Each structure stands twice: as C-alpha cells, then as structure tokens.
Ligand binder design. Structure first.
Ligand SMILES: Nc1nc2c(ncn2[C@H]2C[C@H](O)[C@@H](COP(=O)(O)O)O2)c(=O)[nH]1
Ligand SMILES: Nc1nc2c(ncn2[C@H]2C[C@H](O)[C@@H](COP(=O)(O)O)O2)c(=O)[nH]1
Lengths: 112, 112
C-alpha cells in the first residue's frame, strides 16, 4: 500500500512540483543524476510497469506526453532520456509507477 | 524520411521479430546491451519522443503495454528497464520513435 510517493502526492512530504493534473504528478528527484532529473508519476497507484493493464493504456501515453512537454518547459531541446525500471534487475526502489526524465548533460550508453 | 527501421519494417533488412500488430513492431537489437535487448517501435513513423502529439496518446501507452507483455514472454520477472532516448544529449541514433527493453542481467544506476 503506502510508498514514499504517497507522502509526495498527499503533500505531507516536501517535493519540488513542476506540474500536476487529475491523472498524474511531476516532481524533481531529491537524488538528481543530471542537472535536470524529475519524475512523472500517475495518481492511480500502479506499483510496477509490469503490473499495468489495458485500462491504463491512455494513462501511460499521457505520462509519456507529460514527460516530453515537461522536458521542453525545462529547456531540454538538445536531448534527454526517459527511464522506467521494473523489479530488482531493473534496480527499482519506489514501487509506484514513475517515468524518470534526465537531461542538461550527455547521457552515455549503455544506460546502466 | 527513410531510416534503418524503414528497412526492418518493410522487411528488406533482416531482423529478429518477437511481435507485430497494426500499430507497432517488436524486434531484437543487433547490438544487445543485455542478454535480452529488443526494441518496441511504432508503425506511424514519429521521429523523436519530443515530436509526439496528443493524437499519439493511445499509441504511446500501447507501445508501453506491448513492451511489458513482451518482457513477460521473454521471462523477465526478476526485472528489466525501458529507455527512450531523445536528440544528441539523449544519445539517439535511429530517428524513429522506439522503446528499448533491457533485462536478464542487473542494470546499474545511473542509467548512463
Ligand atoms: N524528490 C524525491 N525523490 C525521491 C525521494 N525518495 C526517493 N526518491 C527518488 C529517488 C529515485 O531516483 C526514485 C525511485 O526510482 P526507482 O529506483 O526506479 O523506483 O525516487 C524523496 O523523498 N524525494
Ligand atoms: N536489430 C537491429 N538494431 C539496430 C540496427 N541498427 C541500429 N539498431 C539499434 C541499435 C540501437 O540500440 C538502436 C537505436 O537507439 P537510439 O540511439 O536510442 O536511437 O537501434 C539493425 O540493423 N538491426
């Protein structure tokens, strides 16, 4: 049930909010891996990306659209990287579905 | 206009195909960065994730759903990572929208 992102959502836990709508939240990462590192999280509290269903189709695309328009607002026109980690081999820590958005520096390959 | 993925789509260029529907293609990466590394590409030839529009909403979520169900089929229950690179700071090479899917080994942090 409750995660760290429960506390960011309900506002009890201080977070840097860049965007909010009825479907999702967008806030900065407290451990930034790039000059701009923010998280695009839904409001329906889907734990992992592998635990998503057809009912979440329109919502996942929306999370992607929100991420790229938030990438623009923060002046990432020279490029950025979106990352969704699953389970332990994915190195997932918070078990609320979120899209990482990283830019303002050159991301390398492999991506971990 | 034409990209490498034009040649994989129209089938002139040999590719390892794991899935195909009317909306997208799913094929292995020729330069695998993990024991399982495949690409989830749409059929509507959107160049970058930052050049996507509201009309592509349902299609982006579908690409994500296809990626996670293809993650299951290839036995990634211990975890995996999805990656969408944009522009040059993203280190994008093919300018057709695609979701990288990597697993079957432990992905590290940062993701590049
Ligand atoms: N802004 C903020 N981010 C957090 C907090 N706790 C964890 N995070 C971030 C750090 C990670 O980059 C991210 C979880 O990523 P993942 O390992 O994919 O679940 O959430 C917090 O209190 N504030
Ligand atoms: N399977 C296959 N993959 C290719 C070929 N050419 C390029 N790729 C892959 C390698 C990269 O991992 C990916 C492009 O990633 P990106 O840099 O994000 O655009 O496409 C090919 O001929 N066959």
């Amino acid at each position: 049930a409750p995660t760290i992102f429960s506390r960011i959502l309900d506002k009890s836990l201080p977070a840097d909010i860049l965007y909010e709508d009825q479907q999702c939240l967008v806030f900065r990462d407290v451990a930034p891996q790039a000059p701009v590192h923010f998280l695009v999280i839904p409001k329906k509290p889907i734990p992992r990306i592998s635990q998503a269903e057809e009912e979440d189709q329109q919502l996942l695309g929306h999370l992607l659209l929100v991420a790229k328009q938030t990438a623009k607002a923060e002046g990432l026109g020279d490029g950025y990287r979106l990352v969704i980690n699953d389970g332990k081999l994915g190195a997932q820590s918070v078990y609320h579905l979120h899209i990482h958005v990283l830019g303002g520096r050159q991301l390398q390959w492999p991506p971990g």
